[PDB]
């Protein structure tokens, strides 16, 4: 959420979600 | 104790009147406020009273506009008393059950909700959505807990307009909205220019949850919510990202293909239910079916059969009493939604 805000601002949301898929 | 208050009728006129109620009990407590169950002294009718700490209340202005068989009706509203503390009380029609409780029962018993109830609840939900969306109102909290049920008649009524907003194009909206499991992906991407199609994504989550016996996308956080979506839809394309949030850019990311819809659900899942779900759970907000288009979907064909009945043998609730307001997104669709046996 603070992490989500950060991922949205940095344009790294999809990359990080794909990584968390584990992968 | 018998409580007497001066309350204003929910729809009209703005003429306040004395209303007396009794048998008061707390039926819910949350961040929003408190929900009570009471009995009106005049008619013996059961009511729910939603009490919120109260600028004009957005929820009240929306509630005063609505009158639909699939939406919990606002009967009265009254203010009560730090003493600078003012509480707004919404007197609503009482409904004993929720789609949450009913689906939980079947899930705990390790059985799927009968397909007839999946059709009946989802069709009534799409009707309530076609209605509110015709006023530009977006609910923004569509989830099983907000779907009330009369267990005997199978009537569904949409409740809790506490997150609702009349959306206006070019006027920004909060992205952190809607209960997580039912949150549209454009909201996860931080969109503030989203539309009423976020409620259609949430309705598709309810449908899938009714078919699975558990939430389709149980994210453990905001980011984990997108992980859960990607496991099914795969990654969005650059065009879908632009359609979700034109302010969000991501040049590089690993492309993940969608998982087949037919393998998301148990093998015996009605293929028409899967087909419908594939047209609601789409990344592109504008590609999702409108609620009126979803009502006319072939998955709901059994509801339009004249010989249709509930498993308890009772007749189905009112399904075809469409108004001009509800049909406004596509008026000619009325002739498909209202079967010959339903016409006057
Ligand atoms: C948060 O905003 C809300 C707005 C309306 C309602 C509401 O309105 C009419 N009935 C209800 C209701 O909850 N009935 C189900 C129920 C009955 C008995 N025990 C538990 C649940 C609830 C919450």
Provide the shortest C-alpha distance from residue B282 to chain A (in Å). 16
Give B41's contacts (C-beta < 8 A, 6+ positions apart).
B2, B20, B21, B22
Compute the distance from residue B98 Cα to the ligand 1 centre, in Å.
Answer: 8
Handedness of CA B207, B208, B211, B212 (dihedral sign): negative
Q: What is the DSSP string of B283-317?
A: SSGGGSPPHHHHHTSGGGGGGG-TT---TTSPPP-
Give B204's contacts (C-beta < 8 A, 6+ positions apart).
B277, B280, B281, B288
In b/e form, how buried is each residue of B97-134, taking b as 16+ CB within 10 angstroms? Answer: ebbbebbeeeeeeeebbebbbbbbbbbbbbbbbbbbbb
Half-sphere exposure for B255 (CA within 13 Å, toward CB) = 5
User: What's the farthest any 2 CA atoms get from each other in chain A?
Assistant: 23
Helix (H, G, I), strand (E, B) or coil at B112: coil
Q: What angle do CA B72, B74, B77 make, to 5 degrees?
A: 150
Contact B71, B132 (CB under 8 A): yes
Point out the ligand 1 atom lying closest to the alpha carbon of residue B101: 21
Q: Pseudo-torsion of CA B227, B233, B234, B239, nearest 10°?
A: -110
According to DSSP, the β-strands at B137-138 and B165-166 are antiparallel
Burial class of B313 by CB neighbour count within 10 A (0 to 12, 13 to 18, 19+): exposed
Which phi-psi region, left, alpha or beta, contains residue B191 (left: φ > 0; alpha: ψ -120 to 50)?
beta
Residue nearest atom 18 of ligand 1, based on CA coordinates: B96
From the list B278, B304, B298, B303, the residue with the least C-alpha distance to B289 is B278
Nearest to B235 among A8, A18, A20 (CB): A18
Residues of B at the annotated binding site? 27-35, 50
Resolution for this experimental structure (Å): 2.0
- The DSSP secondary-structure symbol of B236 reads P
Catalytic residues of B: 141
Residue nearest atom 20 of ligand 1, based on CA coordinates: B27
Paired strand residues for B25? B37
Q: What is the DSSP string of B5-42?
A: EEEEESSS----EEEEEEEEEEEEE-SS-EEEEEEETT
Name the one residue in this structure whose structure tokens are 């148990």: B266
Contact B210, B265 (CB under 8 A): no
What CA–CA distances, in Å, run from B228 to B183, B199, B219, B220, B288?
Answer: 11, 18, 6, 9, 19
Q: What angle do CA B80, B67, B152 make, to 5 degrees?
A: 95
Compute the distance from residue A6 Cα to the ligand 1 centre, in Å.
Answer: 37
CB within 8 Å: B235 and A21: no
Cα of B36 vs its chain's centroid, Å: 21
- What domains are defined for chain B? 18-96 (3.30.200.20), 97-344 (1.10.510.10)
Q: Is the CB of B99 under 6 A from ligand 1?
A: no
Name the one residue in this structure whose structure tokens are 């189905």: B316
Residue B179, chain A, CB below 8 Å: the answer is: no
Half-sphere exposure for B334 (CA within 13 Å, toward CB) = 13
């Amino acid at each position: 959420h603070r992490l989500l805000q950060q991922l949205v601002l940095s344009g790294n949301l999809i990359k990080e979600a794909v990584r968390r898929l584990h992968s | 104790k018998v409580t007497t208050v001066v309350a204003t009728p929910g729809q009209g006129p703005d003429r306040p009147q004395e209303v007396s109620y009794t048998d008061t009990k707390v039926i819910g407590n949350g961040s929003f406020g408190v929900v009570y169950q009471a009995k009106l002294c005049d008619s013996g009718e059961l009511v729910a009273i939603k009490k919120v700490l109260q600028f004009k209340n957005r929820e009240l202005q929306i509630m005063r506009k609505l009158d639909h068989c699939n939406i919990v009706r606002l009967r009265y509203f009254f203010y009560s008393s730090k003493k600078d503390e003012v509480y707004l009380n919404l007197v609503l029609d009482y409904v004993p059950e929720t789609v949450y409780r009913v689906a939980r029962h079947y899930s705990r018993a390790k059985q799927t909700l009968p397909v007839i109830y999946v059709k009946l609840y989802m069709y009534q939900l799409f009707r309530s959505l076609a209605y509110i969306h015709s006023f530009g109102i977006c609910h923004r909290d569509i989830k099983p807990q907000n779907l009330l049920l009369d267990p005997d008649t199978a009537v569904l009524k949409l409740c809790d307009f506490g997150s609702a907003k009349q959306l206006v194009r070019g006027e920004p909206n909060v992205s952190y909205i809607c209960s997580r499991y039912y949150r549209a992906p454009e909201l996860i991407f931080g969109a503030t220019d989203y539309t009423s199609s976020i409620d259609v994504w949430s309705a598709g989550c309810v449908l899938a949850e009714l078919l699975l016996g558990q939430p389709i996308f149980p994210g453990d956080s905001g980011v984990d919510q997108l992980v859960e979506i990607i496991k099914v839809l795969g990654t969005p394309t650059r065009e879908q990202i632009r359609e979700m949030n034109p302010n969000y850019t991501e040049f590089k990311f690993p492309q993940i293909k969608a998982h087949p819809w037919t393998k998301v659900f148990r093998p015996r899942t009605p293929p028409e239910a899967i087909a419908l779900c594939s047209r609601l759970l789409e990344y592109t907000p504008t590609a999702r079916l409108t609620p009126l288009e979803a009502c006319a979907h072939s998955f709901f064909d059994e509801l339009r059969d004249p010989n249709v009945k509930l498993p308890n043998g009772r007749d189905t609730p009112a399904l075809f009493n469409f108004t001009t307001q509800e049909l406004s997104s596509n008026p000619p669709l009325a002739t498909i939604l209202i079967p010959p046996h339903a016409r006057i």
